[PDB]
Amino acid sequence: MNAPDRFELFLLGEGESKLKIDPDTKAPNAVVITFEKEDHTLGNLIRAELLNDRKVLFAAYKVEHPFFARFKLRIQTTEGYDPKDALKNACNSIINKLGALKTNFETEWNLQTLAA
Amino acid sequence: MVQQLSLFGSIGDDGYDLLISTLTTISGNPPLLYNSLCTVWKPNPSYDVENVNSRNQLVEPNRIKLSKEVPFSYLIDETMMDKPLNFRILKSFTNDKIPLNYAMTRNILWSLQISDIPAAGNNRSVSMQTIAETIILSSAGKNSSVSSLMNGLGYVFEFQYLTIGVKFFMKHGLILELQKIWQIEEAGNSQITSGGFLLKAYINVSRGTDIDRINYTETALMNLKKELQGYIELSVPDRQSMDSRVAHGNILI
Amino acid sequence: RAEGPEELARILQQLKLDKIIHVLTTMFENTWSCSRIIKIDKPIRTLLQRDLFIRLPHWPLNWYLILSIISSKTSCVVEKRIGKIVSQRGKWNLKYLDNSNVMTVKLESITYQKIMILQRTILNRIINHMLIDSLNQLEIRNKICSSEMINEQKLPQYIIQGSNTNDNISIITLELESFLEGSKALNSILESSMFLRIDYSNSQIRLYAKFKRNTMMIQCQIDKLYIHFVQEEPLAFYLEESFTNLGIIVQYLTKFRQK
Amino acid sequence: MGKSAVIFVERATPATLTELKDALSNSILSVRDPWSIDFRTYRCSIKNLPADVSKLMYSITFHHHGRQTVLIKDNSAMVTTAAAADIPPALVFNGSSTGVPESIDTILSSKLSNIWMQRQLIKGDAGETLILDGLTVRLVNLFSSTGFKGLLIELQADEAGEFETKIAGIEGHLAEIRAKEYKTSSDSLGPDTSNEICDLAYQYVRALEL
Amino acid sequence: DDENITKLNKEIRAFDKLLNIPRRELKINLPLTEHKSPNLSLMLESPNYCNALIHIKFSAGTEANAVSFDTTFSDFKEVEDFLHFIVAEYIQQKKV
């Protein structure tokens, strides 16, 4: 049997970096960032958030083969602005949105329990 | 970890003095006195190592060497402080008796070292051996001692011996050693190299993959051997004598 | 290893700038704790500008003496101010900056004696500024009775009395409406301006107010209310209290306000 | 004689390190180069063992203290080096050493692999070191195989007179950031024999145990 | 151990007084009353055999270990300026 172990989907191997950043040689201010042990759940969210920044020109991701858990992201931003900073802003905005969502759901659930 | 490339030989003490002079005529350096003390440790037979993969032979048990330098104040008796500390003192070291006895060495209890049998094949002109080495700097705790440490790892004492000799440093990192070996037991001290000196010329290579360096090292060793033709015959020892695995017992001395 | 003529000119300009910076930093350290960690995103508004943030261990927290060094091709000047900076989530935030009391000083005039006199006066200046900031947190308007203000004799003379050119006495003019948090029913009784005088040597806080109209109730004995009326100005009274910690002075003010 | 202490916080957040870095920013005098640390546990593979003989062996590798490994077993310490510049000259001269040793972790995991086998590995990289008034504080995030583990704080001072006061102050500083479950340790391996790095490794072991 | 290495070590160490870096120290004690005697210790060194480094330690008459000032200087002009400042400070202290 040649079936790989399932835990290779969520445990990094030794000597593995969760992120790898590489400058793109074709378009200025463009970076290709490889994420490991991740799938569409994160890439879709990050790209949809990166599309809201008026200084972000290009943002696209892909998962080359459905056997391996990894994906590539590509970012291109305006002059005088770092793609890593854009990624940081996107992550901060996502975290704030999720926190607000959690607080709202807890308030509504407690109100329902009072009305239960 | 090094690849040590070595050649061996022996001489009778009668020519000893003469030999020394000739070496200084070649190297241009004077000999330097040295000594050492080695203790050999073997895996504990009380513990059954079933982990030795018998169906595959991934590994075989081996013996560990712990070495240390001992000051000459333990090796010089009350008759010898008058002479200066130089190589000539070796001329008086012909008796099986020695000032360092069993009790002092027991009171003592560094460099940790493991080796493998030399490389196989009959197309090798020098003894090539692989050595893995580490250093112990200090320790602490309620049982800080070499014996307690090696029993913690899982090893026990087997025997020990004492080397005294002289060193010559030549070009290209070549080291030439003249040694005398005294085995030590509670029963007493016996000189195995009785009435002679053991000669060993060797070089160290840091990386085994580099082959230009290894070829250069072999060239230097064979040139040195071809220089000493007619006086001393330097030879490759027996490959089965430098094997230090526990399963089979023999000791090149 | 420089490559460009513009690079060489920039190198020499930076050489002059940081040589001056090193000289003055050594001057401060030979007498002062600078900070080499703080980086502000935007240079402070006042040609090369360099910001240096200095303080002392016994100063109030987050209060820094800020020096803006402005270097030109032929002349250099120093802007000395007092500011409040905090660090939050890896960022330096300019919490507060003072611009009404900017000390613009030429490079040559600065000497050791001026440095030590500034060291002595800056503690009182920072205490006044932090009192101002606390009152702003209380949303109370205020104005500083500086040395020039006191010398102009526009303030009431009884307040100036006892201030024998001592830096331990600080007088601040407060608005009656602001100190009362908008109580407009008391504007017709007391003057719109009150005076807070704090003596560090005496550790005393006095709130002086002036009656807008002469009420006959002054003739009555008000000794039981800890109110002392000014002999020179019968319409002027004051409340005197003793304080030990400045951080709780706000409560004292409320106590005064209560009275 | 210098003194040291180690505090480990298990329920920390990813941003707790930044929170403690900023909460101490008033007293921060300077910052120095980053550090790293490794923590392995080796297990005994032999079954014919006595009841009183321990089974584990903790290896702690210090990167900033000149690349040194410390092996700990049953309150017994062993300090090994692997740099050519730490070798006592006598061993080089007499021939007891070839001059280019290996780390003891390679020896345990290559030649003695039939007695000892690895069981876990906890790493810490890109820590920050801050100089406060008569104090040095080092912070780092601990990463296991699965992911983030917790926060590690190590304090070192030269004067031992007021060490307890500094420890209490740092504990209070953590207290305002509402990190209430923290395990601290400043014990000494040997009351009579004082080795700094051995005691530091023992304190690490006592802090990191579960 | 061996005679040759000790002989060479002895012969080389014999030249320390010539090869070693020159150093100088000057201690100045100022006569002051009220059992308050400040000390001024100036040590001059040439770490790279050509540059002059002047380390100044001025201890005011308050405590035996409370060093009022401890500074280093590489420019003689700044040395003279700080000496003048210290003299002025001492004069002011004597005037108060």
Side-chain angles (χ1 to χ4, degrees), chain C residues 93-126:
Chain C
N93 289 328
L94 192 67
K95 191 181 182 191
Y96 160 76
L97 167 63
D98 168 41
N99 267 316
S100 62
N101 288 319
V102 171
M103 281 75 88
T104 304
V105 183
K106 305 173 183 180
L107 177 63
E108 306 177 0
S109 62
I110 306 189
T111 59
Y112 279 68
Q113 303 174 346
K114 283 183 174 181
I115 286 181
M116 65 182 179
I117 294 181
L118 174 56
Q119 169 187 16
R120 304 190 71 261
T121 58
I122 199 71
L123 175 57
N124 302 114
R125 300 174 180 182
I126 286 179

mmCIF file of all heavy atoms in Angstrom, chain C residues 93-126:
data_model
loop_
_atom_site.group_PDB
_atom_site.id
_atom_site.type_symbol
_atom_site.label_atom_id
_atom_site.label_comp_id
_atom_site.label_asym_id
_atom_site.label_seq_id
_atom_site.Cartn_x
_atom_site.Cartn_y
_atom_site.Cartn_z
ATOM 1 N N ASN C 93 3.319 56.096 19.666
ATOM 2 C CA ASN C 93 2.225 57.037 19.478
ATOM 3 C C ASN C 93 2.526 58.322 20.234
ATOM 4 O O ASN C 93 2.762 58.298 21.446
ATOM 5 C CB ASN C 93 0.901 56.439 19.964
ATOM 6 C CG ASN C 93 0.391 55.343 19.055
ATOM 7 O OD1 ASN C 93 0.615 55.368 17.845
ATOM 8 N ND2 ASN C 93 -0.300 54.368 19.636
ATOM 9 N N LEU C 94 2.507 59.446 19.515
ATOM 10 C CA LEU C 94 2.735 60.756 20.117
ATOM 11 C C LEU C 94 1.456 61.165 20.839
ATOM 12 O O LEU C 94 0.553 61.769 20.258
ATOM 13 C CB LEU C 94 3.136 61.776 19.059
ATOM 14 C CG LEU C 94 3.681 63.108 19.573
ATOM 15 C CD1 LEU C 94 5.019 62.908 20.264
ATOM 16 C CD2 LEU C 94 3.815 64.101 18.433
ATOM 17 N N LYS C 95 1.379 60.814 22.125
ATOM 18 C CA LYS C 95 0.159 61.061 22.885
ATOM 19 C C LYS C 95 -0.126 62.550 23.019
ATOM 20 O O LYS C 95 -1.278 62.982 22.904
ATOM 21 C CB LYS C 95 0.253 60.406 24.262
ATOM 22 C CG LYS C 95 -1.061 60.392 25.025
ATOM 23 C CD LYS C 95 -0.907 59.761 26.398
ATOM 24 C CE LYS C 95 -2.236 59.716 27.136
ATOM 25 N NZ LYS C 95 -2.071 59.355 28.571
ATOM 26 N N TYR C 96 0.908 63.355 23.266
ATOM 27 C CA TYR C 96 0.691 64.788 23.429
ATOM 28 C C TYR C 96 1.975 65.543 23.128
ATOM 29 O O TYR C 96 3.068 65.070 23.440
ATOM 30 C CB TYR C 96 0.202 65.117 24.846
ATOM 31 C CG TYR C 96 0.407 66.558 25.251
ATOM 32 C CD1 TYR C 96 -0.416 67.563 24.759
ATOM 33 C CD2 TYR C 96 1.423 66.918 26.128
ATOM 34 C CE1 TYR C 96 -0.232 68.881 25.126
ATOM 35 C CE2 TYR C 96 1.614 68.236 26.500
ATOM 36 C CZ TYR C 96 0.783 69.213 25.996
ATOM 37 O OH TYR C 96 0.970 70.527 26.367
ATOM 38 N N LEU C 97 1.827 66.728 22.531
ATOM 39 C CA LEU C 97 2.943 67.621 22.255
ATOM 40 C C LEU C 97 2.537 69.042 22.613
ATOM 41 O O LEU C 97 1.390 69.441 22.394
ATOM 42 C CB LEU C 97 3.365 67.544 20.781
ATOM 43 C CG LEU C 97 4.308 68.629 20.258
ATOM 44 C CD1 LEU C 97 5.642 68.577 20.981
ATOM 45 C CD2 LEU C 97 4.500 68.498 18.756
ATOM 46 N N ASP C 98 3.478 69.802 23.167
ATOM 47 C CA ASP C 98 3.251 71.191 23.549
ATOM 48 C C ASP C 98 3.945 72.110 22.551
ATOM 49 O O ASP C 98 5.126 71.919 22.242
ATOM 50 C CB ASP C 98 3.767 71.457 24.966
ATOM 51 C CG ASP C 98 3.810 72.938 25.300
ATOM 52 O OD1 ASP C 98 2.858 73.659 24.934
ATOM 53 O OD2 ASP C 98 4.793 73.376 25.929
ATOM 54 N N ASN C 99 3.208 73.105 22.053
ATOM 55 C CA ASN C 99 3.740 74.059 21.091
ATOM 56 C C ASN C 99 3.759 75.499 21.585
ATOM 57 O O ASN C 99 4.492 76.313 21.014
ATOM 58 C CB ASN C 99 2.940 74.006 19.780
ATOM 59 C CG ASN C 99 3.553 73.065 18.762
ATOM 60 O OD1 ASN C 99 4.765 73.060 18.555
ATOM 61 N ND2 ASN C 99 2.715 72.263 18.118
ATOM 62 N N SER C 100 2.979 75.838 22.613
ATOM 63 C CA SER C 100 2.965 77.207 23.117
ATOM 64 C C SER C 100 4.248 77.571 23.848
ATOM 65 O O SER C 100 4.549 78.760 23.995
ATOM 66 C CB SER C 100 1.764 77.412 24.041
ATOM 67 O OG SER C 100 1.837 76.556 25.170
ATOM 68 N N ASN C 101 5.011 76.579 24.309
ATOM 69 C CA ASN C 101 6.230 76.837 25.063
ATOM 70 C C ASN C 101 7.441 76.213 24.383
ATOM 71 O O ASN C 101 8.248 75.541 25.033
ATOM 72 C CB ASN C 101 6.094 76.317 26.496
ATOM 73 C CG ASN C 101 5.158 77.161 27.335
ATOM 74 O OD1 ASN C 101 5.170 78.390 27.251
ATOM 75 N ND2 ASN C 101 4.339 76.509 28.148
ATOM 76 N N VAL C 102 7.563 76.398 23.072
ATOM 77 C CA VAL C 102 8.721 75.909 22.335
ATOM 78 C C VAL C 102 9.908 76.823 22.608
ATOM 79 O O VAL C 102 9.828 78.040 22.399
ATOM 80 C CB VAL C 102 8.417 75.835 20.829
ATOM 81 C CG1 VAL C 102 9.685 75.546 20.044
ATOM 82 C CG2 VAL C 102 7.362 74.778 20.554
ATOM 83 N N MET C 103 11.012 76.243 23.078
ATOM 84 C CA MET C 103 12.244 76.998 23.295
ATOM 85 C C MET C 103 13.123 76.877 22.057
ATOM 86 O O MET C 103 13.716 75.822 21.812
ATOM 87 C CB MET C 103 12.983 76.504 24.537
ATOM 88 C CG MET C 103 12.425 77.002 25.859
ATOM 89 S SD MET C 103 10.900 76.182 26.348
ATOM 90 C CE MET C 103 11.544 74.766 27.233
ATOM 91 N N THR C 104 13.205 77.949 21.275
ATOM 92 C CA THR C 104 14.063 78.000 20.097
ATOM 93 C C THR C 104 15.388 78.632 20.509
ATOM 94 O O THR C 104 15.441 79.818 20.845
ATOM 95 C CB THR C 104 13.402 78.789 18.969
ATOM 96 O OG1 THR C 104 12.125 78.218 18.667
ATOM 97 C CG2 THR C 104 14.272 78.762 17.722
ATOM 98 N N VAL C 105 16.457 77.838 20.481
ATOM 99 C CA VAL C 105 17.759 78.251 20.993
ATOM 100 C C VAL C 105 18.814 78.030 19.917
ATOM 101 O O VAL C 105 18.815 77.001 19.230
ATOM 102 C CB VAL C 105 18.126 77.487 22.284
ATOM 103 C CG1 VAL C 105 19.445 77.983 22.843
ATOM 104 C CG2 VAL C 105 17.020 77.638 23.321
ATOM 105 N N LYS C 106 19.707 79.003 19.770
ATOM 106 C CA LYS C 106 20.815 78.868 18.837
ATOM 107 C C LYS C 106 21.816 77.835 19.343
ATOM 108 O O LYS C 106 21.918 77.571 20.543
ATOM 109 C CB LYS C 106 21.507 80.214 18.626
ATOM 110 C CG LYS C 106 20.569 81.323 18.179
ATOM 111 C CD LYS C 106 21.277 82.668 18.143
ATOM 112 C CE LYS C 106 20.315 83.784 17.776
ATOM 113 N NZ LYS C 106 20.988 85.111 17.747
ATOM 114 N N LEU C 107 22.558 77.245 18.404
ATOM 115 C CA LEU C 107 23.498 76.183 18.749
ATOM 116 C C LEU C 107 24.609 76.687 19.661
ATOM 117 O O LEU C 107 24.989 76.007 20.622
ATOM 118 C CB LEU C 107 24.085 75.577 17.473
ATOM 119 C CG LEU C 107 25.153 74.499 17.650
ATOM 120 C CD1 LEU C 107 24.579 73.291 18.371
ATOM 121 C CD2 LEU C 107 25.738 74.100 16.305
ATOM 122 N N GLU C 108 25.146 77.876 19.373
ATOM 123 C CA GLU C 108 26.323 78.355 20.091
ATOM 124 C C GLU C 108 26.013 78.664 21.553
ATOM 125 O O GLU C 108 26.856 78.442 22.430
ATOM 126 C CB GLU C 108 26.884 79.594 19.392
ATOM 127 C CG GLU C 108 27.177 79.391 17.915
ATOM 128 C CD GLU C 108 27.672 80.657 17.240
ATOM 129 O OE1 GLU C 108 27.791 81.690 17.927
ATOM 130 O OE2 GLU C 108 27.937 80.614 16.021
ATOM 131 N N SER C 109 24.813 79.177 21.833
ATOM 132 C CA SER C 109 24.523 79.699 23.164
ATOM 133 C C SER C 109 24.433 78.602 24.220
ATOM 134 O O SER C 109 24.571 78.887 25.413
ATOM 135 C CB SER C 109 23.224 80.508 23.134
ATOM 136 O OG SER C 109 22.127 79.694 22.763
ATOM 137 N N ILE C 110 24.205 77.351 23.810
ATOM 138 C CA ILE C 110 24.018 76.279 24.780
ATOM 139 C C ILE C 110 25.332 75.986 25.492
ATOM 140 O O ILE C 110 26.371 75.774 24.854
ATOM 141 C CB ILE C 110 23.464 75.025 24.087
ATOM 142 C CG1 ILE C 110 22.198 75.368 23.298
ATOM 143 C CG2 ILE C 110 23.179 73.934 25.109
ATOM 144 C CD1 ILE C 110 21.468 74.160 22.752
ATOM 145 N N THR C 111 25.288 75.975 26.824
ATOM 146 C CA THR C 111 26.457 75.720 27.659
ATOM 147 C C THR C 111 26.053 74.806 28.812
ATOM 148 O O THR C 111 24.879 74.460 28.974
ATOM 149 C CB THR C 111 27.067 77.023 28.198
ATOM 150 O OG1 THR C 111 26.088 77.727 28.973
ATOM 151 C CG2 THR C 111 27.555 77.912 27.060
ATOM 152 N N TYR C 112 27.045 74.410 29.615
ATOM 153 C CA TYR C 112 26.785 73.505 30.731
ATOM 154 C C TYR C 112 25.846 74.132 31.753
ATOM 155 O O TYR C 112 24.919 73.477 32.249
ATOM 156 C CB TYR C 112 28.092 73.113 31.416
ATOM 157 C CG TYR C 112 28.867 72.005 30.743
ATOM 158 C CD1 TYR C 112 29.458 72.203 29.504
ATOM 159 C CD2 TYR C 112 28.998 70.762 31.346
ATOM 160 C CE1 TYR C 112 30.172 71.196 28.889
ATOM 161 C CE2 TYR C 112 29.707 69.747 30.735
ATOM 162 C CZ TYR C 112 30.290 69.968 29.506
ATOM 163 O OH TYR C 112 30.998 68.961 28.890
ATOM 164 N N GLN C 113 26.088 75.400 32.103
ATOM 165 C CA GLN C 113 25.263 76.062 33.107
ATOM 166 C C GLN C 113 23.821 76.187 32.635
ATOM 167 O O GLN C 113 22.883 75.989 33.417
ATOM 168 C CB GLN C 113 25.845 77.434 33.438
ATOM 169 C CG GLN C 113 27.285 77.387 33.923
ATOM 170 C CD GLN C 113 27.882 78.766 34.118
ATOM 171 O OE1 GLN C 113 27.326 79.766 33.662
ATOM 172 N NE2 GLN C 113 29.023 78.825 34.798
ATOM 173 N N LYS C 114 23.622 76.516 31.357
ATOM 174 C CA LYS C 114 22.271 76.521 30.809
ATOM 175 C C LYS C 114 21.654 75.132 30.876
ATOM 176 O O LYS C 114 20.456 74.990 31.148
ATOM 177 C CB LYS C 114 22.285 77.039 29.370
ATOM 178 C CG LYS C 114 22.415 78.550 29.263
ATOM 179 C CD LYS C 114 22.349 79.011 27.817
ATOM 180 C CE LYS C 114 22.340 80.527 27.724
ATOM 181 N NZ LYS C 114 22.247 80.998 26.313
ATOM 182 N N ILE C 115 22.462 74.092 30.652
ATOM 183 C CA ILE C 115 21.953 72.724 30.715
ATOM 184 C C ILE C 115 21.450 72.404 32.118
ATOM 185 O O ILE C 115 20.359 71.852 32.297
ATOM 186 C CB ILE C 115 23.034 71.726 30.260
ATOM 187 C CG1 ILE C 115 23.208 71.784 28.741
ATOM 188 C CG2 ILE C 115 22.686 70.314 30.707
ATOM 189 C CD1 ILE C 115 24.242 70.820 28.207
ATOM 190 N N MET C 116 22.229 72.766 33.143
ATOM 191 C CA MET C 116 21.811 72.439 34.505
ATOM 192 C C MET C 116 20.640 73.303 34.965
ATOM 193 O O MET C 116 19.762 72.818 35.692
ATOM 194 C CB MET C 116 22.993 72.551 35.471
ATOM 195 C CG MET C 116 23.559 73.947 35.655
ATOM 196 S SD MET C 116 24.978 73.954 36.772
ATOM 197 C CE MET C 116 25.409 75.689 36.765
ATOM 198 N N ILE C 117 20.592 74.572 34.545
ATOM 199 C CA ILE C 117 19.441 75.407 34.875
ATOM 200 C C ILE C 117 18.179 74.864 34.218
ATOM 201 O O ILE C 117 17.103 74.835 34.830
ATOM 202 C CB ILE C 117 19.711 76.872 34.479
ATOM 203 C CG1 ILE C 117 20.841 77.451 35.329
ATOM 204 C CG2 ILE C 117 18.450 77.709 34.626
ATOM 205 C CD1 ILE C 117 21.150 78.902 35.024
ATOM 206 N N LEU C 118 18.290 74.420 32.961
ATOM 207 C CA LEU C 118 17.164 73.773 32.299
ATOM 208 C C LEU C 118 16.768 72.492 33.018
ATOM 209 O O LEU C 118 15.579 72.194 33.136
ATOM 210 C CB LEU C 118 17.511 73.482 30.839
ATOM 211 C CG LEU C 118 16.495 72.685 30.020
ATOM 212 C CD1 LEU C 118 15.130 73.353 30.046
ATOM 213 C CD2 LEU C 118 16.984 72.510 28.590
ATOM 214 N N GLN C 119 17.747 71.725 33.500
ATOM 215 C CA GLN C 119 17.442 70.526 34.270
ATOM 216 C C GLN C 119 16.633 70.857 35.515
ATOM 217 O O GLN C 119 15.678 70.150 35.855
ATOM 218 C CB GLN C 119 18.738 69.808 34.650
ATOM 219 C CG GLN C 119 18.561 68.699 35.674
ATOM 220 C CD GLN C 119 19.884 68.129 36.144
ATOM 221 O OE1 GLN C 119 20.941 68.730 35.945
ATOM 222 N NE2 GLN C 119 19.835 66.961 36.774
ATOM 223 N N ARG C 120 17.008 71.930 36.214
ATOM 224 C CA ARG C 120 16.268 72.314 37.415
ATOM 225 C C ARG C 120 14.861 72.802 37.081
ATOM 226 O O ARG C 120 13.895 72.431 37.761
ATOM 227 C CB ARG C 120 17.035 73.385 38.192
ATOM 228 C CG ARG C 120 18.453 72.991 38.563
ATOM 229 C CD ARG C 120 19.069 73.981 39.542
ATOM 230 N NE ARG C 120 18.473 73.892 40.869
ATOM 231 C CZ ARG C 120 17.527 74.701 41.326
ATOM 232 N NH1 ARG C 120 17.039 75.683 40.587
ATOM 233 N NH2 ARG C 120 17.057 74.519 42.559
ATOM 234 N N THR C 121 14.721 73.628 36.040
ATOM 235 C CA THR C 121 13.420 74.230 35.748
ATOM 236 C C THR C 121 12.469 73.254 35.061
ATOM 237 O O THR C 121 11.242 73.407 35.165
ATOM 238 C CB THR C 121 13.603 75.477 34.881
ATOM 239 O OG1 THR C 121 14.280 75.122 33.668
ATOM 240 C CG2 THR C 121 14.417 76.525 35.623
ATOM 241 N N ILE C 122 13.009 72.257 34.355
ATOM 242 C CA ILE C 122 12.182 71.388 33.531
ATOM 243 C C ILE C 122 11.269 70.523 34.384
ATOM 244 O O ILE C 122 10.184 70.144 33.940
ATOM 245 C CB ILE C 122 13.076 70.547 32.598
ATOM 246 C CG1 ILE C 122 12.260 69.998 31.424
ATOM 247 C CG2 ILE C 122 13.763 69.430 33.362
ATOM 248 C CD1 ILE C 122 11.862 71.053 30.422
ATOM 249 N N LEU C 123 11.677 70.194 35.613
ATOM 250 C CA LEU C 123 10.796 69.422 36.485
ATOM 251 C C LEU C 123 9.527 70.202 36.805
ATOM 252 O O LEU C 123 8.415 69.670 36.707
ATOM 253 C CB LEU C 123 11.534 69.033 37.768
ATOM 254 C CG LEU C 123 10.690 68.315 38.819
ATOM 255 C CD1 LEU C 123 10.064 67.055 38.239
ATOM 256 C CD2 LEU C 123 11.525 67.981 40.045
ATOM 257 N N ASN C 124 9.676 71.476 37.173
ATOM 258 C CA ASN C 124 8.513 72.309 37.445
ATOM 259 C C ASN C 124 7.680 72.520 36.188
ATOM 260 O O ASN C 124 6.441 72.496 36.239
ATOM 261 C CB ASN C 124 8.955 73.652 38.025
ATOM 262 C CG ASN C 124 9.759 73.498 39.300
ATOM 263 O OD1 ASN C 124 10.948 73.810 39.340
ATOM 264 N ND2 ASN C 124 9.112 73.009 40.352
ATOM 265 N N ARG C 125 8.339 72.731 35.045
ATOM 266 C CA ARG C 125 7.601 72.910 33.797
ATOM 267 C C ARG C 125 6.797 71.662 33.446
ATOM 268 O O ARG C 125 5.639 71.757 33.017
ATOM 269 C CB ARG C 125 8.565 73.275 32.667
ATOM 270 C CG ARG C 125 9.336 74.559 32.922
ATOM 271 C CD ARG C 125 10.389 74.809 31.855
ATOM 272 N NE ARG C 125 11.128 76.039 32.109
ATOM 273 C CZ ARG C 125 12.080 76.520 31.319
ATOM 274 N NH1 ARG C 125 12.442 75.892 30.214
ATOM 275 N NH2 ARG C 125 12.683 77.657 31.651
ATOM 276 N N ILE C 126 7.388 70.482 33.640
ATOM 277 C CA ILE C 126 6.697 69.231 33.346
ATOM 278 C C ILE C 126 5.553 69.005 34.326
ATOM 279 O O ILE C 126 4.499 68.484 33.953
ATOM 280 C CB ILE C 126 7.702 68.063 33.351
ATOM 281 C CG1 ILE C 126 8.564 68.105 32.090
ATOM 282 C CG2 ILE C 126 6.985 66.723 33.458
ATOM 283 C CD1 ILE C 126 9.594 67.003 32.021
#
